[PDB]
Amino acid sequence: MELIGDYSKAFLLQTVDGKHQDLKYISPETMVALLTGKFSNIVDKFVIVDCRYPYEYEGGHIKTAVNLPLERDAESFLLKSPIAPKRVILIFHSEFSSERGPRMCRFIRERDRAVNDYPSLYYPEMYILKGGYKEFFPQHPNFCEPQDYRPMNHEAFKDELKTFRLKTRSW
């Protein structure tokens, strides 16, 4: 397997197959391994980036996850003042981690490359949580808060979906 983004070392986590062949995916179990400190001696810090809309996040998210659905906010939070460490790892996810999560992952790498001298990166190691929140919640409810799951297409949030999308950079 290839080295991480800055070609400094191998990827630390075991991966699983995912739709986007060029990205690295991890399972809910591996996400829990990170959250339970199984890699504390090597991983200084990791950030779980929930790329879903605010109402989805509010309806139930992974503990400690940060809601950064808008590209400009994800960039500001992660690259304005890079989180320095050991390793730093980013884990992106959305509802199914089919579109929004992967898109933000690619976006951050694009920006990371743009503000660095090749091949250096602030976040050389990034993963996608396979199955997204939809598959994580049924496996580890006590690692979520609140302990619920609100889909993007929830019937009671149709207006909220439209409101949020009109704030995005492109549709």
Identity (one letter) of the amino acid at 164? F
**Distance between CA atoms of 145 and 148, rounded to whole angstroms?**
7
**Distance between CA atoms of 33 and 65, rounded to whole angstroms?**
15
Structure tokens at 87: 């390793």
**Distance between CA atoms of 97 and 67, rounded to whole angstroms?**
14
Decide the pairing of beta strands 126-129 and 25-26. parallel
Give the shortest CB-58-to-Cl ion separation in angstroms. 19
Structure tokens at 146: 């609140």
Residue nearer to Cl ion on the CB measure, 118 or 171: 171
Query: One symbol per residue from 23 to 62: x for binding Cl ion (CB under 5 A), - otherwise; what is it?
Result: ----------------------------------------
| Measured CA distances, 32 to 38, 50, 90, 91 (Å) | 9, 15, 14, 12
Give the shortest CB-92-to-Cl ion separation in angstroms. 12
Residue 169 engages Cl ion in binding (rule: CB under 5 A)? yes
Residue nearer to Cl ion on the CB measure, 4 or 51: 51
Give the shortest CB-24-to-Cl ion separation in angstroms. 12
Residue nearer to Cl ion on the CB measure, 39 or 53: 53
Taking the mean position of all CA atoms in its chain, how far away is CA 103?
10
Pick one of 70, 79, 83, 161: the residue that binds Cl ion (CB under 5 A): 70
Pick one of 50, 71, 75, 112: the residue that binds Cl ion (CB under 5 A): 71
**Stretch of 69-77, 133-141, 143-151, 154-162 lying at the interface with Cl ion (CB under 5 A):** 69-77
Interface residues toward Cl ion, by CB under 5 A: 18-19, 70-71, 168-169
